[PDB]
Structure 1
């Protein structure tokens, strides 16, 4: 409808795949080469389905901060025959608050879904499903099961991936440029 949705659509149409694990179907953001991200609660194994194609996992790393606290981001390298558009220049360098964010989802259940979530708070610490978690962003939208892995954008920035909710608020794990230096 506007430039927020325009930037979100541009990311969804080139930089997302549908990932399926034994824990369900997830929006999965491709960042560069064969490297993508997914919430750590997806429990990625040796094999994953990418757009319903059996795909070997070449590497999978559940990120933690230097306090050894969960970040809820898993970085996956996929045995895929095609590279993602490199979007690392749209990643923030620092933890921040944001205005006017969009959460975008693409699964079998929720295709071509875009949610204007509004103001995004650097919330920081969250007890997420019983697990102490750092670098959490919060937005005031009643997100539901099926939205995990959803991409959070502003105009010009890819800032996080949806990892949970409490029925009234939704929570995303930050994406930082420093996670994807090679």
Structure 2
């Protein structure tokens, strides 16, 4: 509808796949080469389905901060025959608050879904499903099951991936440039 949705659509059309684990179907953001991200609660194993094709996982790292606190981001290297467009230059360098963000989801249940979530707070600490979690972004939208892995963007930045909600607010894990050097 406008330039927020334009940037979101550009990311979805080239930099997302549908990932399936034993824990469900997730939006998965490809960042560069064969490297992608997914919520840690997807429980990535040795094999994952990528657009319904059996794919070997070459490496998987569940990120934690230097206090040994969950960040809810798993970085996955896929045994895929094709690279992602390199979008690392759209990643923020530091923790921040944002205006006018879009959450974009693409799964079998929710194809071509875009949600204007509005203002995004650097929330910080969240007890996410019982697990202490840091670097959480919050937006005041009633996000639902099937949105995990959804990409959070502003115009010109890819800022996070959706990891949960409480019925009234949604929560994303930050993406930072330093995760992907």
TM surpasses 0.5: yes
Tell me, in whole angstroms, the C-alpha distance in 1 between the residues paired with 2:117 and 2:140. 7
Partner Cα distance (1:82, 1:53) in 2 = 13
Q: TM-score, normalised by structure 2?
A: 1.00
Q: Secondary structure at the match of 2:76?
A: strand
Shift in Å at residue 170 of structure 1?
0.0
Separation (CA, whole Å) in 2 of partners of 1:67 and 1:169: 26
Shift of 1:117: 0.1
Q: Secondary structure at the match of 1:41?
A: helix
Residue in 1 aligned with 2:39?
A: 39
> How much has 1:85 moved relative to structure 2?
0.0
Give unpaired runs (5+ residues) of structure 1: none
Q: CA RMSD in A?
A: 0.1
Q: CA deviation at 1:167?
A: 0.1
The C-alpha deviation readout for 1:135-177, integer Å capped at 9, x for no partner, is: 0000000000000000000000000000000000000000000
Structure 2: which 5+ residue stretches go unaligned?
A: none
Q: Per-residue deviation at 1:19?
A: 0.1
User: Which whole-Å deviations, capped at 9, do the CAs of 1:69-88 have from their partners, x for residues lacking one?
Assistant: 00000000000000000000
2:144 and 2:129 map into 1 onto residues whose CA distance is 14
2:142 and 2:180 map into 1 onto residues whose CA distance is: 30
**1:103: Cα distance to partner?**
0.1
The Cα shift of 1:36 comes to: 0.0
Report deviation, 1:31: 0.0
4+ long deviations beyond 2 Å = none
Task: Give the TM-score of the pair, scaled to structure 1.
Answer: 0.99
- Give the count of matched residue pairs: 181
